[PDB]
Design an enzyme around this catalytic site. Structure first.
Site, PDB file in Angstrom:
ATOM      1  N   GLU A 141       0.336  -1.291 -10.045  1.00 42.17           N
ATOM      2  CA  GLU A 141      -0.442  -1.769 -11.186  1.00 42.17           C
ATOM      3  C   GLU A 141       0.445  -2.464 -12.214  1.00 42.17           C
ATOM      4  O   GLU A 141       0.053  -3.478 -12.802  1.00 42.17           O
ATOM      5  CB  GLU A 141      -1.191  -0.602 -11.831  1.00 42.17           C
ATOM      6  N   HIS A 142       1.647  -1.934 -12.443  1.00 44.79           N
ATOM      7  CA  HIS A 142       2.563  -2.576 -13.378  1.00 44.79           C
ATOM      8  C   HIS A 142       3.027  -3.935 -12.870  1.00 44.79           C
ATOM      9  O   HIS A 142       3.320  -4.827 -13.676  1.00 44.79           O
ATOM     10  CB  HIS A 142       3.766  -1.673 -13.636  1.00 44.79           C
TER      11      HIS A 142
END
Ligand SMILES: CCCCCCCCCCCCCCCCCC(=O)OC[C@H](COP(=O)([O-])OCC(O)COP(=O)([O-])OC[C@@H](COC(=O)CCCCCCCCCCCCCCCCC)OC(=O)CCCCCCCCCCCCCCCCC)OC(=O)CCCCCCCCCCCCCCCCC
Ligand SMILES: CCCCCCCCCCCCCC(=O)OC[C@H](COP(=O)(O)OCC[N+](C)(C)C)OC(=O)CCCCCCCCCCCCC
Ligand SMILES: CCCCCC(=O)OC[C@H](COP(=O)([O-])OCCN)OC(=O)CCCCC
Ligand SMILES: CCCCCC(=O)OC[C@H](COP(=O)([O-])OCCN)OC(=O)CCCCC
Lengths: 49, 61, 105, 34, 425, 446, 50
Positions: free
Chosen positions: F60-61
């Site tokens: 997600e990052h």
């Protein structure tokens, strides 16, 4: 840092019907409760007598 | 996958406290008969022909 | 309005003077038995009525201790007895009855 | 639940620069409910 | 085919007594109603500060047609909602429920706003809620900055806090609440907005129950900009700071230029955890600052005034460097260094953001309600986008010029050892 | 005018198509100039092993930080310049990436979602950057007592299973997760049949399907070389975890029993019960006059700052219960009243209060699906969990069935005489002992 | 006094009725068993004796 926490293993104390971490505990919830409450029922019988 | 006897006892008798108590009082009633019946049967089988219950037949008349 | 409802007041004035809490400088609402409804009504009184109610009651408990009464000049006149608490008390009851009607829906 | 918006119990701390974006205000509003 | 029906058009009406009604029938399962009133905290004076806050907490108190108990239980039985939102300009009484129960909640909404009793004891029990409600809000350092920012910017009116001053808690009287509703909850000051309700019903309601005269005509108590600064030394880890100047009143074309200027500089993040590559202020600060921070343009527009500038968060030692870097970036725009693709991109964000803010019923009702009070009309979105498109690049530059040369207002809180005063910029 | 029943028919049915490779494409059309489109994925911590836990959160990052066709910040620039918004989230079972944008920008938005999923850069230098970021986010989360105590609830309740794991993973895994670990996670879990391209707003379903067949054809086929993630059931354990910390001003408690799962009809009746108990915090207006006895008592006697009921669903399991926040001398009273309401609903629920709970759920359901984003979320999630979209007309039918007899039967099935999971954090000396808690799950009078 | 007669209170009555009739079975059976009430205990089959 609180995600580093893990609950320790209790397999040394778990009953037979529970040690499978991939098997539902509700399948044995009535047999396990019944066994412990059967101990209590027969106890009050003797105190009653 | 039929639930064992302990599980069927819980579902039918123990879950409700009232039915849990009803079978204690009924359990006491039937336990009392069979316990005093069986217990007295041991006490006298040990002491067979030693006390009045056994020699009652001699002195009937 | 008539003469029949006027001697009705005469016997209520009679019972009032016989009840004799006016002899201790007290008013009818000073003598109501405190239940939950009344304790709420007293809580709702403005500062002047609350403080007046406190002193009249204190003055009467003082007199009662000595088994005395006030001079007749200072008795509570039946004509001047302000039912100061029943407006507040009637609204307390009205609110409670509303809760009770909702509680059975 | 009460609200305060303005961007257009120990709460929580902010340390990094990625979780800090979105905090600077952008006109206040105060709301109340049941 | 799976398509939506013919979307009905919003209906709108102005009664001769000044009241405004606007209805829309989206045939939705839920209905929403709002009574928007020009009764925000600007209409308090220095003898009754905080009255509109306590009034905002007293919607469930006892009215003439409904006990406090009935309001709470009546609305909850239907699963509906009753809310009160306040701006420095408006109060907004909003009600939500399923469309079969609109009769019930309308009756409650009218009793709250038209027939409050403000009983001495109910009011007395409610005063401690001011302390709790204010304490919750001020958990955000932003909240006290903006409150201080308006107190430093203005002499009166908009200087007033949304939250009751500490010295007034316990001292707001039932008489002050009575006078406040009499002076400010007038037909000329009101707007009745409804979704999922038909227009004949709202009009009938308005003519029958919302014809209140007298009080105060739309007073010309004009907000007087002043400039100044307020500095709150505390023990926060970061310094929050805001720097603004008088800008433009809402509705005017200059205000649209300020809105566009906001999105040129940087209003907020559009991507999660992004560097904000297209944020002019963020990149300006990030060049000479390699520590955590935030910076955003600030735009607030009111009926007779406005504030524009930026808002900064930084380490206490990097305070001035972030401030000055942000300020110089605005100076660049005032000097005419502004590309046209950057404006078309800002007009894209602003146009996109506006339409997004009106997707839902709550955001749509709020815009219609505040349009009705500020403008006395309803302006559909296609016309809003037209007014945005009409902003020229020179208008944006002149807006940035008005900021650089205008008397400033600053509010800051934190460890201010390295936080400049105004004259040090 | 239209009635509430008539209004529920007036919602357009979600049109559903499936591509040739497995991907599912679903849309609800409206008359909006805006819209939201996104990809929902059957992925999360429950699929991760202890050795690669936290991987999907690492992804997600990195999802928005670069790609092959648009390296670096080029992806931020494109969405910001068209005024769009880009977001993502990860639970223990689901992962989503979605865009909010204009309806005319839908074809570009679909293209970007496709480029994010399939073609991700994952430069080794960006990873080392995002490593220190996650560790700081972990220090931040440690100060949210709410987020802690729910990670504790999962940790004890599902001990020994994948669901016990947090989404973010431990600090040790963050410091050693390599690029090979991440690509293995993606290649396994990011496959067309386990994904849904959901959209909601002003857009024809024909258009969305055309773009799916264009930009999502390159996905992996239906077969995956025999290496499918098959979620095993997760043992629930009646247990308790207490983190004593008297330096904190307020105690957090969370307590729950095992719930059924996503596609079980019992969830409806359970949600009605949770609505009767409801929620509360100190800023509400009702206070003494609130319907819920727990709320009314808590406001009158000031037993808590806030409480909330919940029904957390997972595949074939869940966490059903409540959570609250209170002063150190109020924990016992809060637990007494809480359990008393569970017991009272198991044994003596009345018809009137169940109508209130039904209406509260009706209102909560309609008003939540208000806007393009929450509809697109319900589209994507509902196809990973139910395999279909449940129209509001059906939800209303499953509610109207509920009466007082239903909640008593349903609540007793899950609450009465069951071992709860407990999690405590803060000044919790007055937290009742587990045996006392366990005895509060039944009434001797019944 | 008559607060407790309405729709909700008759529902509570009908909810706890099955339970109270069972506690009457506990008490009644408990009274027979404790006092050895022979008038009842003759028809039940097994306890007949002594
Ligand atoms: C011999 C005399 C027997 C007296 C029995 C009194 C019955 C009674 O008070 O009913 C309350 C009790 C209410 O309990 P509940 O329904 O579980 O609700 C709990 C409350 O909300 C309140 O629950 P709680 O969480 O606040 O408290 C739990 C409480 C619940 O249990 C009790 O309240 C029992 C009261 C003490 C009885 C003492 C027995 C002697 O357990 C106790 O604290 C008792 C511990 C006793 C330790 C003594 C050590 C020696 O109802 C019954 O248990 C009646 C059934 C008794 C069967 C009688 C056989 C014929
Ligand atoms: C006029 C004539 C009337 C005659 C009436 C006859 C009635 C006979 C008694 C029946 C009442 C049964 C009540 C009952 O069992 O509850 C009391 C507790 C509960 O046990 P526990 O297993 O905690 O919970 C059971 C929960 N359940 C029902 C959902 C399965 O049960 C126990 O925990 C009790 C076990 C310990 C008993 C010993 C207490 C006596 C004191 C100490 C004796 C030795 C030295 C003096
Ligand atoms: C004639 C019947 C008397 C019943 C007494 C009784 O049940 O007391 C409570 C406990 C068990 O209930 P609990 O503690 O689980 O609480 C249940 C909460 N719902 O039982 C005991 O351990 C007490 C021992 C008494 C010895 C004198
Ligand atoms: C309240 C204290 C009760 C004391 C009773 C007593 O001491 O026992 C006598 C009888 C014996 O049963 P029976 O069949 O011989 O019958 C003999 C008839 N005289 O038992 C009963 O009948 C129990 C009745 C209980 C009623 C409250």
């Amino acid at each position: 840092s609180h995600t580093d926490i893990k609950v320790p293993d209790f397999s040394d104390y778990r009953r037979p019907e529970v040690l499978d971490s991939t098997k539902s505990s509700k399948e044995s919830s009535e047999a396990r409760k019944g066994f412990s409450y059967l101990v209590t029922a027969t106890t009050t019988v003797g105190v009653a007598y | 996958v039929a639930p064992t006897l302990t599980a069927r006892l819980y579902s039918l008798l123990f879950r409700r406290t009232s039915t849990f108590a009803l079978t204690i009082v009924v359990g006491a009633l039937f336990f009392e008969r069979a316990f005093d019946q069986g217990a007295d049967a041991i006490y006298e089988h040990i002491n067979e022909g030693k006390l009045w219950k056994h020699i009652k037949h001699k002195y009937e008349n | 309005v008539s003469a029949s409802s006027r001697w009705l007041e005469g016997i209520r004035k009679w019972y009032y003077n016989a009840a004799g809490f006016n002899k201790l400088g007290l008013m009818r609402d000073d003598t109501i038995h405190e239940n939950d409804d009344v304790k709420e009504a007293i809580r709702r009184l403005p500062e002047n009525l609350y403080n007046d109610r406190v002193f009249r009651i204190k003055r009467a408990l003082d007199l009662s201790m000595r088994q005395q009464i006030l001079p007749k000049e200072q008795w509570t006149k039946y004509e001047e007895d302000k039912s100061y608490l029943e407006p507040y008390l009637k609204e307390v009851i009205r609110e409670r009855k509303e809760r009770e009607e909702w509680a059975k829906k | 639940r009460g609200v305060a918006g303005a961007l257009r119990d120990l709460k929580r701390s902010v340390l990094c620069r990625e979780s800090l974006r979105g905090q600077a205000a952008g006109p206040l509003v105060a709301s109340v409910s049941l | 085919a799976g398509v939506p029906p013919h979307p009905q058009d919003l209906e709108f009406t102005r009664l001769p007594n000044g009241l405004v009604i606007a209805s829309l029938e989206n045939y939705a399962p839920a209905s929403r109603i709002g009574l928007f009133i020009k009764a925000g905290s600007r209409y308090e004076n220095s003898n009754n500060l905080g009255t509109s806050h306590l009034l905002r907490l007293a919607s469930s108190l006892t009215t003439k047609g409904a006990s406090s108990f009935k309001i709470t239980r009546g609305i909850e039985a239907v699963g509906g909602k009753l809310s009160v939102t306040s701006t420095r300009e408006n109060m907004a009484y909003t009600v939500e429920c399923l469309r079969d129960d609109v009769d019930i909640l309308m009756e409650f909404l009218l009793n709250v706003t038209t027939a409050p009793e403000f009983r001495r004891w109910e009011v007395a029990a409610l005063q401690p809620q001011l302390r709790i409600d204010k304490a919750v809000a001020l958990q955000n350092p932003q909240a006290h900055v903006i409150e201080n920012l308006h107190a430093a910017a203005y002499r009166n009116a908009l200087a007033n806090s949304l939250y009751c001053p500490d010295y007034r808690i316990g001292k707001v009287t039932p008489v002050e609440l009575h006078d406040y509703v009499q002076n400010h909850f007038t037909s000329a000051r009101m707007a009745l907005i409804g979704l999922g309700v038909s227009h004949p019903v709202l009009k009938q309601v308005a003519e029958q129950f919302l014809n209140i005269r007298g009080g105060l005509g739309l007073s010309g108590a004009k907000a007087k900009y002043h400039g100044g600064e307020i500095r709150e030394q505390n023990g926060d880890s970061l310094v929050h700071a805001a720097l603004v100047a008088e800008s433009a009143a809402i509705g005017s074309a200059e205000a649209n230029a300020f809105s566009v200027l906001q999105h040129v500089l940087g209003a907020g993040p559009h991507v999660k955890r992004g560097s904000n590559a297209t944020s002019s202020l963020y990149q300006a600060v990030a060049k000479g600052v390699h520590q955590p921070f935030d910076v955003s343009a600030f735009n607030a527009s009111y009926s007779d005034s406005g504030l524009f500038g930026f808002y900064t968060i930084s380490q206490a030692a990097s305070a001035g460097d972030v401030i000055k870097a942000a300020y110089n970036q605005v100076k660049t725009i005032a000097q005419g260094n502004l590309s046209n693709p950057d404006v078309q991109a800002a007009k894209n964000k602003l146009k996109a953001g506006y339409l997004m803010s009106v997707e839902s019923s709550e955001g749509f009702l709020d815009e219609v309600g505040s349009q009705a009070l500020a403008a006395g009309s309803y302006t559909p979105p296609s016309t809003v986008l037209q007014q945005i498109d009409a902003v020229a690049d020179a208008d944006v530059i002149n807006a940035a010029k008005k900021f650089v040369s205008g008397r400033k207002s600053m509010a800051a809180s934190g460890n201010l050892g390295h936080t400049p005063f105004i004259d040090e910029l | 005018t239209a009635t509430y029943a008539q209004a529920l028919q007036s919602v357009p049915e979600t049109q559903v198509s499936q591509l040739d490779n497995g991907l599912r494409v679903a849309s609800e059309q409206s008359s909006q100039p805006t819209c939201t489109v996104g990809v929902w994925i059957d992925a999360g911590s429950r699929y991760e092993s202890e050795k690669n836990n936290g991987a999907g959160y690492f992804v997600e990052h990195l999802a928005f930080k670069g790609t092959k066709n648009r390296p670096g910040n080029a992806l931020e620039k494109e969405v910001e310049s068209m005024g769009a918004h880009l977001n993502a989230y990860s639970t223990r079972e689901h992962t989503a990436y979605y865009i909010k944008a204009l309806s005319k920008d839908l074809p570009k938005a679909v293209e970007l979602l496709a480029d994010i999923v399939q073609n991700c850069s994952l430069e080794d230098s960006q990873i080392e950057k995002e490593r220190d970021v996650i560790l700081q986010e972990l220090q931040e989360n440690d100060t949210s007592m709410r987020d802690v105590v729910f990670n504790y609830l999962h940790a004890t309740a599902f001990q020994g299973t994948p669901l016990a794991q947090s989404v973010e993973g431990p600090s040790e895994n963050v410091r050693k997760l390599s690029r090979a670990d991440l690509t293995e996670y993606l290649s396994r879990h990011y496959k067309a049949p386990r994904m849904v391209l959901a959209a909601a707003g002003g857009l024809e379903h024909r258009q969305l399907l055309d773009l799916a067949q264009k930009h999502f054809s390159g996905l992996s086929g239906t077969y995956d070389e025999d290496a499918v993630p098959t979620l095993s059931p997760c043992r629930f354990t009646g247990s308790q975890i207490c983190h004593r910390e008297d330096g904190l001003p307020l105690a957090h408690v969370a307590i729950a029993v095992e719930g059924p799962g996503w596609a079980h009809p019992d969830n409806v009746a359970l949600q009605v019960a949770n609505a009767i108990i409801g929620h509360y915090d100190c800023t509400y207006g009702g206070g003494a006059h609130l319907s819920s006895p727990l709320a009314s008592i808590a406001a009158t006697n000031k037993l808590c700052q806030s409480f909330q009921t919940f029904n957390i669903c997972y595949a074939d399991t869940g966490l059903l219960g409540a959570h609250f926040v209170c002063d150190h001398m109020s924990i016992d009273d809060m637990m007494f009243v809480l359990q008393g309401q569970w017991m009272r609903l198991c044994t003596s629920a009345t018809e009137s209060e169940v109508l209130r709970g039904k209406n509260l759920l009706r209102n909560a359901l309609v008003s939540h699906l208000d806007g393009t984003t929450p509809v697109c979320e319900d589209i994507g999630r509902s196809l990973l969990t139910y395999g279909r979209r449940i129209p509001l007309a059906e939800w209303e039918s499953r509610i109207a069935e509920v009466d007082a007899r239903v909640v008593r039967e349903v609540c007793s099935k899950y609450f009465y005489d069951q071992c709860p999971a407990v999690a405590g954090f803060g000044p919790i000396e007055q937290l009742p002992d587990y045996n006392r808690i366990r005895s509060g799950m039944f009434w001797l009078r019944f | 006094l008559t607060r407790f007669l309405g729709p909700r209170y008759r529902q509570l009555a009908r909810n706890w009725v099955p339970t109270a009739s069972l506690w009457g079975a506990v008490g009644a059976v408990g009274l027979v068993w404790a006092t050895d009430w022979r008038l009842i205990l003759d028809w039940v089959p097994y306890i007949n004796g002594k």
